[PDB]
């Protein structure tokens, strides 16, 4: 199995952007997807229970499309590295990375 992402994305301050990962070349069951930064959870999509949004992001994260997420009302403080962690059976964990830069043109 391989997890692939855009790698680097840029978006304008105040706008919204979709963060997304694609798991391919595996038939493993996706049971949970965690979206996070290094020291901070954004949101989790659990296959059985639905979406959990972290308190720090409640009013600025829209779940989806699909297993991605839309980060809204971007600030320049959102520039940084994001991770998408797929928990799958039987393969285990796949981890994707996205670097986001929020621009002030």
């Amino acid at each position, epitope marked *: 199995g391989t997890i692939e992402t855009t790698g680097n994305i840029s978006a304008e301050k105040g706008g919204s952007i979709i963060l997304q990962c694609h798991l391919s070349s595996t038939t493993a069951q996706v049971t949970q997807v965690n979206w996070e930064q290094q020291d901070q959870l954004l949101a989790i999509c659990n296959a*059985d229970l639905g979406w959990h949004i972290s308190p720090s992001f409640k009013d600025r994260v829209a779940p989806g499309p699909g297993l991605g997420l839309t980060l809204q009302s971007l600030t320049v403080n959102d520039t940084g590295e994001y991770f998408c962690i797929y928990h799958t059976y039987p393969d285990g964990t796949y981890t994707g990375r996205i670097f986001l830069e929020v621009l002030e043109s």
Partner: antibody, heavy 120, light 112 residues
Framework: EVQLVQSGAEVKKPGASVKVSCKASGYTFTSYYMHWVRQAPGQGLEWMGIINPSGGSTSYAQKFQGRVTMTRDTSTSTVYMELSSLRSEDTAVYYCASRSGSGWFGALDYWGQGTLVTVS | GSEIVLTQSPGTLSLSPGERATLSCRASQSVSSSYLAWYQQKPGQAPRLLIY???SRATGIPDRFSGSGSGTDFTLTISRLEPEDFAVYYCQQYGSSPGGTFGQGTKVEIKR
């Protein structure tokens, strides 16, 4: 203070089913998830699954899918866990656990007293 | 299936009151500190939450219990061991599912 009070010990033959319960008291809000976690002799903790506030949604560990059914009596604040096709590896102390919030994510700060289920 | 495995060391600690107890946990893959918990289980009792988010103390838990670590290696420290701390201590990560996975525990024994 939140209290989780579980049903009493059970002895079951191999191949039988067992149904254990836990009543929650002391919550200052209505909606909370409920988990079950078991502890076989000398081993560590093993999460079994979770049920949502209404009882309409559940999630079980892969090894228990097909063998475990949780239900919830919202009117009595009681959760039930039924485990079928009992085998020796199922002898364990079964714990109900929950947490100090309404969502399903986080460590578990509330625990029942345990229910010993012995198979043979 | 491949699950995240937590390996606690040592299996047993035997220390005297007032000493420092250092408990270690190795994770089979790197895990965010937002997902790490420690529990204390005294004999015949249910687990009791001590630490969550790797380093935050649960309500009512005194500062002598502290958690630290990152990536694949985490620790629970009891700064002054007390006789009532006789218990098995479990590490948990709760990031892979609502309940996650647990280590096998470190038994802490108190001398004399």
């Amino acid at each position: 203070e939140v209290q989780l009070v579980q049903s009493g010990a059970e002895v079951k033959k191999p191949g039988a089913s067992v149904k254990v319960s836990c009543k929650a008291s002391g919550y200052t809000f209505t909606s909370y998830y409920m988990h079950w976690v078991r502890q076989a002799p000398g081993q560590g903790l093993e999460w079994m699954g979770i049920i949502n506030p209404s009882g309409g949604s559940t999630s079980y560990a892969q090894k228990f899918q097909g063998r475990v059914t949780m239900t919830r009596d919202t009117s009595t604040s009681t959760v039930y866990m039924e485990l079928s096709s009992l085998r020796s590896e199922d002898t364990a102390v079964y714990y109900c656990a929950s947490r100090s919030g309404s969502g399903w994510f986080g460590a578990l700060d509330y625990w029942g007293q345990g229910t010993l289920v012995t198979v043979s | 299936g491949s699950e995240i495995v937590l390996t606690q060391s040592p299996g047993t600690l035997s220390l005297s009151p007032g000493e420092r107890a250092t408990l270690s946990c190795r994770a089979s893959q790197s895990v965010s500190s937002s997902y790490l918990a420690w529990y204390q289980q005294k004999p015949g009792q249910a687990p009791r939450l001590l630490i969550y988010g790797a380093s935050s103390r649960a309500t009512g838990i005194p500062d002598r219990f502290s958690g630290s670590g990152s990536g694949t290696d985490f620790t629970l420290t009891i700064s002054r061991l007390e006789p009532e701390d006789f218990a098995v201590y479990y590490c948990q990560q709760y990031g892979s599912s609502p309940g996650g996975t647990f280590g096998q525990g470190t038994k802490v024994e108190i001398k004399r």
